[PDB]
mmCIF file of C-alpha atoms and ligand atoms in Angstrom:
data_model
loop_
_atom_site.group_PDB
_atom_site.id
_atom_site.type_symbol
_atom_site.label_atom_id
_atom_site.label_comp_id
_atom_site.label_asym_id
_atom_site.label_seq_id
_atom_site.Cartn_x
_atom_site.Cartn_y
_atom_site.Cartn_z
ATOM 1 C CA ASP A 1 2.945 25.307 -11.126
ATOM 2 C CA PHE A 2 0.953 24.277 -13.865
ATOM 3 C CA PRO A 3 -2.564 25.538 -15.738
ATOM 4 C CA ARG A 4 -5.493 23.525 -15.997
ATOM 5 C CA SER A 5 -5.947 24.785 -19.631
ATOM 6 C CA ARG A 6 -2.856 22.355 -20.532
ATOM 7 C CA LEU A 7 -4.592 19.320 -19.444
ATOM 8 C CA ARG A 8 -6.959 16.976 -21.789
ATOM 9 C CA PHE A 9 -8.962 15.229 -19.558
ATOM 10 C CA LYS A 10 -9.407 11.538 -21.502
ATOM 11 C CA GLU A 11 -10.743 9.144 -18.614
ATOM 12 C CA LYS A 12 -11.751 8.307 -15.348
ATOM 13 C CA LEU A 13 -9.428 6.202 -12.943
ATOM 14 C CA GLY A 14 -11.303 6.963 -9.332
ATOM 15 C CA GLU A 15 -13.257 8.127 -6.935
ATOM 16 C CA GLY A 16 -12.157 9.363 -3.566
ATOM 17 C CA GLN A 17 -13.646 10.733 -0.605
ATOM 18 C CA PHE A 18 -12.733 14.235 -1.071
ATOM 19 C CA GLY A 19 -11.348 13.940 -4.895
ATOM 20 C CA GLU A 20 -11.593 12.285 -8.235
ATOM 21 C CA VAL A 21 -8.555 10.692 -10.463
ATOM 22 C CA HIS A 22 -8.503 11.542 -14.157
ATOM 23 C CA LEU A 23 -5.992 10.395 -16.826
ATOM 24 C CA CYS A 24 -4.779 13.603 -18.796
ATOM 25 C CA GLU A 25 -2.716 14.224 -21.858
ATOM 26 C CA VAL A 26 -0.139 17.061 -21.963
ATOM 27 C CA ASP A 27 0.724 18.333 -24.982
ATOM 28 C CA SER A 28 3.423 21.265 -23.988
ATOM 29 C CA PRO A 29 5.156 19.708 -21.154
ATOM 30 C CA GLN A 30 8.245 21.628 -19.033
ATOM 31 C CA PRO A 31 1.840 12.367 -25.916
ATOM 32 C CA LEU A 32 2.280 12.710 -22.006
ATOM 33 C CA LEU A 33 0.209 11.028 -20.001
ATOM 34 C CA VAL A 34 -0.773 11.980 -16.207
ATOM 35 C CA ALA A 35 -2.813 11.248 -13.605
ATOM 36 C CA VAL A 36 -4.754 14.328 -11.985
ATOM 37 C CA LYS A 37 -6.669 14.422 -8.954
ATOM 38 C CA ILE A 38 -9.578 17.504 -8.774
ATOM 39 C CA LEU A 39 -11.923 18.287 -6.187
ATOM 40 C CA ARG A 40 -15.305 15.947 -6.645
ATOM 41 C CA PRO A 41 -18.421 18.001 -8.443
ATOM 42 C CA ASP A 42 -20.249 18.493 -4.637
ATOM 43 C CA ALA A 43 -16.883 19.868 -3.317
ATOM 44 C CA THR A 44 -17.317 20.579 0.529
ATOM 45 C CA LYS A 45 -15.012 23.350 2.849
ATOM 46 C CA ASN A 46 -14.080 19.915 4.529
ATOM 47 C CA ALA A 47 -13.259 18.410 1.278
ATOM 48 C CA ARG A 48 -10.949 21.094 0.158
ATOM 49 C CA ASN A 49 -9.497 21.209 3.253
ATOM 50 C CA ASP A 50 -8.213 17.416 3.385
ATOM 51 C CA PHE A 51 -7.244 18.099 -0.549
ATOM 52 C CA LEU A 52 -4.797 20.876 0.287
ATOM 53 C CA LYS A 53 -3.206 18.747 3.403
ATOM 54 C CA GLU A 54 -2.592 15.514 0.841
ATOM 55 C CA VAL A 55 -0.996 18.150 -1.706
ATOM 56 C CA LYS A 56 1.517 19.095 1.748
ATOM 57 C CA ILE A 57 1.945 15.500 2.719
ATOM 58 C CA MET A 58 2.654 14.193 -0.507
ATOM 59 C CA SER A 59 5.114 17.048 -1.039
ATOM 60 C CA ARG A 60 7.609 15.365 1.831
ATOM 61 C CA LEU A 61 7.940 12.294 -0.824
ATOM 62 C CA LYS A 62 10.677 11.676 -3.118
ATOM 63 C CA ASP A 63 11.919 8.736 -3.800
ATOM 64 C CA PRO A 64 11.549 5.785 -6.854
ATOM 65 C CA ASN A 65 9.516 4.079 -5.190
ATOM 66 C CA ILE A 66 7.136 5.801 -3.712
ATOM 67 C CA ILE A 67 4.206 7.975 -5.274
ATOM 68 C CA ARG A 68 5.498 11.557 -6.466
ATOM 69 C CA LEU A 69 3.702 14.816 -7.033
ATOM 70 C CA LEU A 70 4.683 16.320 -10.369
ATOM 71 C CA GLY A 71 2.797 19.494 -10.192
ATOM 72 C CA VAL A 72 -0.136 21.076 -8.749
ATOM 73 C CA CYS A 73 -2.345 23.952 -10.255
ATOM 74 C CA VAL A 74 -2.273 27.617 -10.594
ATOM 75 C CA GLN A 75 -3.602 28.887 -7.723
ATOM 76 C CA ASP A 76 -6.968 30.732 -8.990
ATOM 77 C CA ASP A 77 -7.892 28.024 -10.847
ATOM 78 C CA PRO A 78 -9.819 24.875 -9.533
ATOM 79 C CA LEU A 79 -7.442 22.645 -7.231
ATOM 80 C CA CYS A 80 -5.616 19.825 -8.690
ATOM 81 C CA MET A 81 -2.851 17.901 -8.356
ATOM 82 C CA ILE A 82 -0.726 15.731 -11.043
ATOM 83 C CA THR A 83 1.165 12.878 -10.506
ATOM 84 C CA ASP A 84 2.706 9.997 -13.208
ATOM 85 C CA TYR A 85 0.046 7.623 -14.643
ATOM 86 C CA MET A 86 0.774 4.036 -13.569
ATOM 87 C CA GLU A 87 -0.302 2.458 -16.304
ATOM 88 C CA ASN A 88 -1.172 -1.060 -14.756
ATOM 89 C CA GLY A 89 -2.916 0.350 -11.951
ATOM 90 C CA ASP A 90 -3.469 -1.265 -8.426
ATOM 91 C CA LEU A 91 -0.772 -4.435 -7.321
ATOM 92 C CA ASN A 92 -3.477 -6.382 -6.005
ATOM 93 C CA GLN A 93 -5.488 -6.256 -9.063
ATOM 94 C CA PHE A 94 -2.408 -6.779 -10.989
ATOM 95 C CA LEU A 95 -1.048 -9.836 -9.564
ATOM 96 C CA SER A 96 -4.629 -11.154 -9.487
ATOM 97 C CA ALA A 97 -4.339 -11.153 -13.074
ATOM 98 C CA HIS A 98 -1.077 -13.456 -13.052
ATOM 99 C CA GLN A 99 -0.318 -16.685 -12.077
ATOM 100 C CA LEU A 100 2.902 -18.446 -10.460
ATOM 101 C CA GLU A 101 4.977 -19.702 -13.855
ATOM 102 C CA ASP A 102 5.198 -23.396 -13.919
ATOM 103 C CA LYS A 103 8.802 -24.004 -14.632
ATOM 104 C CA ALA A 104 8.402 -27.366 -16.307
ATOM 105 C CA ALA A 105 6.257 -26.498 -19.095
ATOM 106 C CA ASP A 106 -2.559 -16.016 -19.339
ATOM 107 C CA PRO A 107 0.461 -14.048 -18.575
ATOM 108 C CA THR A 108 2.773 -15.144 -15.530
ATOM 109 C CA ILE A 109 4.992 -14.188 -12.853
ATOM 110 C CA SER A 110 8.237 -15.797 -11.889
ATOM 111 C CA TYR A 111 9.651 -16.118 -7.756
ATOM 112 C CA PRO A 112 12.477 -14.083 -8.765
ATOM 113 C CA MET A 113 10.350 -11.675 -9.979
ATOM 114 C CA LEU A 114 7.985 -11.514 -6.868
ATOM 115 C CA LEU A 115 11.004 -10.910 -4.940
ATOM 116 C CA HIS A 116 11.775 -7.710 -7.291
ATOM 117 C CA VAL A 117 8.374 -6.163 -6.420
ATOM 118 C CA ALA A 118 8.613 -6.642 -2.720
ATOM 119 C CA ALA A 119 11.758 -5.799 -2.636
ATOM 120 C CA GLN A 120 10.814 -2.510 -3.857
ATOM 121 C CA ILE A 121 8.263 -1.964 -1.438
ATOM 122 C CA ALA A 122 10.668 -2.565 1.054
ATOM 123 C CA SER A 123 12.705 0.382 -0.394
ATOM 124 C CA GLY A 124 10.246 2.645 -0.367
ATOM 125 C CA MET A 125 9.513 1.909 3.283
ATOM 126 C CA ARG A 126 13.009 2.296 4.214
ATOM 127 C CA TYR A 127 12.724 5.649 2.573
ATOM 128 C CA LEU A 128 9.562 6.737 4.624
ATOM 129 C CA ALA A 129 11.276 5.344 7.841
ATOM 130 C CA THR A 130 14.461 7.969 7.100
ATOM 131 C CA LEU A 131 11.674 10.525 7.476
ATOM 132 C CA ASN A 132 10.047 9.550 10.493
ATOM 133 C CA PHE A 133 7.047 8.987 8.078
ATOM 134 C CA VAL A 134 4.243 6.559 9.021
ATOM 135 C CA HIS A 135 1.792 4.754 6.067
ATOM 136 C CA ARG A 136 -0.684 3.524 8.227
ATOM 137 C CA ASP A 137 -2.316 1.439 5.608
ATOM 138 C CA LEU A 138 0.645 -0.503 3.894
ATOM 139 C CA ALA A 139 -1.072 -3.439 1.433
ATOM 140 C CA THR A 140 -1.311 -4.426 -2.420
ATOM 141 C CA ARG A 141 -4.313 -2.253 -2.909
ATOM 142 C CA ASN A 142 -2.270 1.139 -1.980
ATOM 143 C CA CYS A 143 0.725 -0.235 -4.391
ATOM 144 C CA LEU A 144 0.902 1.098 -7.582
ATOM 145 C CA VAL A 145 2.423 -0.852 -11.038
ATOM 146 C CA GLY A 146 3.889 0.737 -14.046
ATOM 147 C CA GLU A 147 6.136 -0.363 -16.993
ATOM 148 C CA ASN A 148 8.456 -3.039 -16.304
ATOM 149 C CA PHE A 149 7.351 -4.516 -13.195
ATOM 150 C CA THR A 150 8.102 -1.192 -11.201
ATOM 151 C CA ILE A 151 6.186 -0.509 -8.282
ATOM 152 C CA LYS A 152 5.391 2.820 -6.247
ATOM 153 C CA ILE A 153 3.793 2.812 -2.714
ATOM 154 C CA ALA A 154 0.650 5.342 -2.724
ATOM 155 C CA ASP A 155 -2.107 5.848 -0.734
ATOM 156 C CA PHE A 156 -5.679 5.593 -2.008
ATOM 157 C CA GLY A 157 -7.842 5.918 1.701
ATOM 158 C CA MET A 158 -10.016 3.604 2.658
ATOM 159 C CA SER A 159 -13.316 4.628 0.775
ATOM 160 C CA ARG A 160 -13.138 2.546 -2.355
ATOM 161 C CA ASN A 161 -16.080 -0.124 -2.899
ATOM 162 C CA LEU A 162 -14.117 -2.782 -4.157
ATOM 163 C CA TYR A 163 -11.673 -3.382 -0.810
ATOM 164 C CA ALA A 164 -14.642 -2.363 1.921
ATOM 165 C CA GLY A 165 -13.961 -5.885 3.627
ATOM 166 C CA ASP A 166 -10.498 -4.592 4.048
ATOM 167 C CA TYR A 167 -11.692 -2.382 6.456
ATOM 168 C CA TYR A 168 -13.564 -2.792 9.985
ATOM 169 C CA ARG A 169 -16.271 0.038 10.313
ATOM 170 C CA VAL A 170 -18.082 1.017 13.815
ATOM 171 C CA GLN A 171 -20.006 4.064 13.940
ATOM 172 C CA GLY A 172 -18.287 7.399 15.538
ATOM 173 C CA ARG A 173 -14.811 5.493 14.962
ATOM 174 C CA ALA A 174 -12.151 5.775 12.900
ATOM 175 C CA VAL A 175 -12.024 3.215 10.024
ATOM 176 C CA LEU A 176 -9.631 0.078 10.311
ATOM 177 C CA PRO A 177 -7.829 -2.276 8.239
ATOM 178 C CA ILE A 178 -7.310 -4.873 11.005
ATOM 179 C CA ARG A 179 -6.091 -8.033 8.791
ATOM 180 C CA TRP A 180 -2.998 -5.888 8.355
ATOM 181 C CA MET A 181 -2.443 -4.473 11.870
ATOM 182 C CA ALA A 182 -0.253 -5.347 14.765
ATOM 183 C CA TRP A 183 -1.765 -6.224 17.796
ATOM 184 C CA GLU A 184 -1.244 -2.893 19.336
ATOM 185 C CA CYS A 185 -2.695 -1.178 16.747
ATOM 186 C CA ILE A 186 -5.536 -3.234 17.079
ATOM 187 C CA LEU A 187 -5.630 -2.836 21.216
ATOM 188 C CA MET A 188 -4.619 0.903 21.634
ATOM 189 C CA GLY A 189 -5.253 2.385 18.329
ATOM 190 C CA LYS A 190 -1.545 3.918 17.288
ATOM 191 C CA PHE A 191 0.523 3.509 14.373
ATOM 192 C CA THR A 192 4.572 3.422 14.323
ATOM 193 C CA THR A 193 7.318 2.354 12.050
ATOM 194 C CA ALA A 194 7.498 -0.992 14.010
ATOM 195 C CA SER A 195 3.644 -1.486 12.908
ATOM 196 C CA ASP A 196 4.630 -0.459 9.209
ATOM 197 C CA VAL A 197 6.639 -3.305 9.411
ATOM 198 C CA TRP A 198 3.954 -5.957 10.537
ATOM 199 C CA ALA A 199 1.989 -4.551 7.637
ATOM 200 C CA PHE A 200 4.639 -5.362 5.572
ATOM 201 C CA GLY A 201 4.877 -8.595 6.594
ATOM 202 C CA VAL A 202 1.259 -9.056 5.420
ATOM 203 C CA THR A 203 1.879 -7.118 2.336
ATOM 204 C CA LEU A 204 4.805 -9.664 1.740
ATOM 205 C CA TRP A 205 2.407 -12.313 2.447
ATOM 206 C CA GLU A 206 -0.128 -10.613 -0.131
ATOM 207 C CA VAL A 207 2.272 -11.110 -2.982
ATOM 208 C CA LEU A 208 3.551 -14.123 -2.483
ATOM 209 C CA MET A 209 -0.103 -15.623 -2.771
ATOM 210 C CA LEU A 210 -0.691 -13.620 -5.526
ATOM 211 C CA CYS A 211 -3.537 -11.801 -3.837
ATOM 212 C CA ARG A 212 -5.754 -14.921 -4.187
ATOM 213 C CA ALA A 213 -6.807 -14.895 -0.644
ATOM 214 C CA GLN A 214 -7.367 -12.164 2.216
ATOM 215 C CA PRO A 215 -5.248 -12.446 4.856
ATOM 216 C CA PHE A 216 -7.278 -14.437 7.595
ATOM 217 C CA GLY A 217 -9.856 -14.837 5.129
ATOM 218 C CA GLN A 218 -11.643 -17.854 6.817
ATOM 219 C CA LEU A 219 -11.916 -15.999 10.208
ATOM 220 C CA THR A 220 -14.135 -13.361 11.065
ATOM 221 C CA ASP A 221 -13.524 -9.344 11.964
ATOM 222 C CA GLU A 222 -14.194 -9.864 15.198
ATOM 223 C CA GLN A 223 -11.584 -13.513 15.694
ATOM 224 C CA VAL A 224 -9.163 -11.099 13.868
ATOM 225 C CA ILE A 225 -9.365 -8.566 16.735
ATOM 226 C CA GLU A 226 -9.769 -10.893 19.294
ATOM 227 C CA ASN A 227 -6.665 -12.471 17.926
ATOM 228 C CA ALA A 228 -5.036 -9.212 18.697
ATOM 229 C CA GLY A 229 -5.609 -10.259 22.254
ATOM 230 C CA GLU A 230 -4.108 -13.194 22.461
ATOM 231 C CA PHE A 231 -0.867 -11.642 21.445
ATOM 232 C CA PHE A 232 -1.233 -8.924 24.312
ATOM 233 C CA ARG A 233 -2.032 -11.954 26.807
ATOM 234 C CA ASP A 234 1.225 -13.796 25.314
ATOM 235 C CA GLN A 235 -0.157 -17.806 26.119
ATOM 236 C CA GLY A 236 0.812 -19.221 23.152
ATOM 237 C CA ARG A 237 -2.873 -19.229 21.710
ATOM 238 C CA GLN A 238 -2.098 -16.637 19.277
ATOM 239 C CA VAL A 239 -2.514 -17.295 15.505
ATOM 240 C CA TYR A 240 -0.111 -16.275 12.068
ATOM 241 C CA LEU A 241 -0.686 -16.420 8.219
ATOM 242 C CA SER A 242 0.491 -19.756 6.650
ATOM 243 C CA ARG A 243 3.184 -20.033 4.402
ATOM 244 C CA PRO A 244 2.019 -19.114 1.168
ATOM 245 C CA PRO A 245 2.674 -21.926 -1.774
ATOM 246 C CA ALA A 246 5.081 -19.939 -3.704
ATOM 247 C CA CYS A 247 7.232 -19.218 -0.382
ATOM 248 C CA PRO A 248 10.017 -21.090 0.693
ATOM 249 C CA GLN A 249 10.739 -21.758 4.247
ATOM 250 C CA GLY A 250 13.535 -19.329 4.565
ATOM 251 C CA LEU A 251 11.662 -16.403 3.298
ATOM 252 C CA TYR A 252 8.531 -17.574 5.578
ATOM 253 C CA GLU A 253 10.314 -16.874 8.313
ATOM 254 C CA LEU A 254 11.335 -13.764 7.785
ATOM 255 C CA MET A 255 7.796 -12.972 7.155
ATOM 256 C CA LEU A 256 6.946 -14.182 10.637
ATOM 257 C CA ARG A 257 9.658 -12.291 12.539
ATOM 258 C CA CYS A 258 7.182 -9.181 11.026
ATOM 259 C CA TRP A 259 4.822 -10.267 13.242
ATOM 260 C CA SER A 260 7.026 -10.667 16.440
ATOM 261 C CA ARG A 261 5.212 -9.452 19.860
ATOM 262 C CA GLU A 262 7.789 -7.002 20.799
ATOM 263 C CA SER A 263 8.301 -4.109 18.106
ATOM 264 C CA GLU A 264 11.849 -3.902 18.998
ATOM 265 C CA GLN A 265 12.390 -7.581 17.566
ATOM 266 C CA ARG A 266 10.510 -6.886 14.111
ATOM 267 C CA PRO A 267 13.267 -6.329 11.412
ATOM 268 C CA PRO A 268 13.862 -2.970 10.214
ATOM 269 C CA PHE A 269 13.175 -2.096 6.385
ATOM 270 C CA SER A 270 16.848 -2.118 5.695
ATOM 271 C CA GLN A 271 17.325 -5.559 6.925
ATOM 272 C CA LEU A 272 13.728 -6.446 4.675
ATOM 273 C CA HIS A 273 15.011 -5.071 1.781
ATOM 274 C CA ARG A 274 18.912 -6.969 1.896
ATOM 275 C CA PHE A 275 17.021 -10.176 2.656
ATOM 276 C CA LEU A 276 14.412 -9.953 -0.417
ATOM 277 C CA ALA A 277 17.272 -7.997 -2.800
ATOM 278 C CA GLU A 278 20.186 -10.487 -2.180
ATOM 279 C CA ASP A 279 19.734 -13.652 0.649
ATOM 280 C CA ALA A 280 16.383 -14.852 -1.235
ATOM 281 C CA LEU A 281 18.157 -15.804 -4.416
ATOM 282 C CA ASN A 282 20.073 -18.875 -3.095
ATOM 283 C CA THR A 283 16.167 -19.786 -2.290
ATOM 284 C CA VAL A 284 15.605 -19.803 -5.872
HETATM 285 O O1 1IZ B 301 -1.336 8.035 -3.698
HETATM 286 C C1 1IZ B 301 -1.771 8.796 -2.344
HETATM 287 N N1 1IZ B 301 -2.611 9.929 -2.658
HETATM 288 C C2 1IZ B 301 -3.520 9.489 -4.172
HETATM 289 C C3 1IZ B 301 -2.992 10.228 -5.293
HETATM 290 C C4 1IZ B 301 -3.041 11.392 -5.396
HETATM 291 C C5 1IZ B 301 -2.652 12.137 -6.883
HETATM 292 C C6 1IZ B 301 -3.421 11.840 -7.690
HETATM 293 C C7 1IZ B 301 -3.136 10.179 -7.928
HETATM 294 C C8 1IZ B 301 -3.459 9.431 -6.426
HETATM 295 C C9 1IZ B 301 -3.283 7.750 -6.555
HETATM 296 C C10 1IZ B 301 -3.811 7.208 -7.738
HETATM 297 O O2 1IZ B 301 -3.004 7.283 -8.648
HETATM 298 C C11 1IZ B 301 -3.260 6.890 -9.970
HETATM 299 C C12 1IZ B 301 -4.118 5.650 -10.033
HETATM 300 C C13 1IZ B 301 -3.962 5.201 -11.168
HETATM 301 C C14 1IZ B 301 -2.512 5.133 -12.291
HETATM 302 N N2 1IZ B 301 -2.179 5.951 -12.066
HETATM 303 C C15 1IZ B 301 -1.979 6.629 -10.972
HETATM 304 C C16 1IZ B 301 -0.769 9.452 -1.344
HETATM 305 C C17 1IZ B 301 -1.603 10.430 -0.053
HETATM 306 C C18 1IZ B 301 -0.967 10.644 0.898
HETATM 307 C C19 1IZ B 301 -0.011 10.183 1.203
HETATM 308 C C20 1IZ B 301 1.035 9.173 0.523
HETATM 309 O O3 1IZ B 301 2.088 8.870 0.728
HETATM 310 C C21 1IZ B 301 2.150 7.568 0.745
HETATM 311 F F1 1IZ B 301 1.723 6.794 0.153
HETATM 312 F F2 1IZ B 301 3.561 7.405 1.357
HETATM 313 F F3 1IZ B 301 1.475 7.273 1.894
HETATM 314 C C22 1IZ B 301 0.192 9.125 -0.896
HETATM 315 CL CL1 CL B 302 -8.286 9.323 -4.601
#
């Protein structure tokens, strides 16, 4: 554990439904920067409950490419969660500020580095699958970036105003990231490792687009939901995300397998990782 007195709050990183995140300095660990989530000023009973469960969920997760809990605060202190500061923020903003390098002749990013980024996400999901842990909301907006393009999968929740358009809302219902969701998820509301594979396909599409466009960006929420119906009825009228310019055809055919109607035919994270780390290198 860790005493709240030993933290030096420095600035504000973001706001959540039941907490808020600050960049803090630690002088006497056991100039070290860390990210700390604490209760919001208007902390409710229900919010303290969700905060404590977040700590329990996060305490399961121990992998180089998954966010890790470095510690929590002593019991009689006001509640806190401490994790590594990821200095380049979320992956969506980060990739947005880069463009594909022009090998012929603003920071840039090469195709092999994009593969490297995608492969780390795949490895993190490989780990989650071994725990039978289902993420439920994989997307570039929920990945963090550290030094040297290191990537860690996290989960900000669905409340950030910046990504409001990524979630479909109906009064009294669960909030749904429908443009990342497998057809069975949209129709029946339930999430599996196989639907995480589907979301990974979309996330891989994002990375290869350098996050310059929303998935199915020219279609409405209602058209995206109706597309799930076309997967169900299986009469060849369903549509897919198109091949990104940075994406060679061999890699795109792997993306497409992530959107197979049958869950069993979607590739496991072990195979996705192997392709991204090895096979995709002869397509460079
Ligand atoms: O990520 C999760 N919760 C949010 C986390 C809470 C602790 C304080 C930091 C904050 C993220 C922002 O962190 C920053 C932000 C900016 C710069 N550096 C760090 C989470 C929650 C449940 C399950 C989970 O597992 C997996 F992701 F697998 F779903 C991950
Ligand atoms: Cl948060």
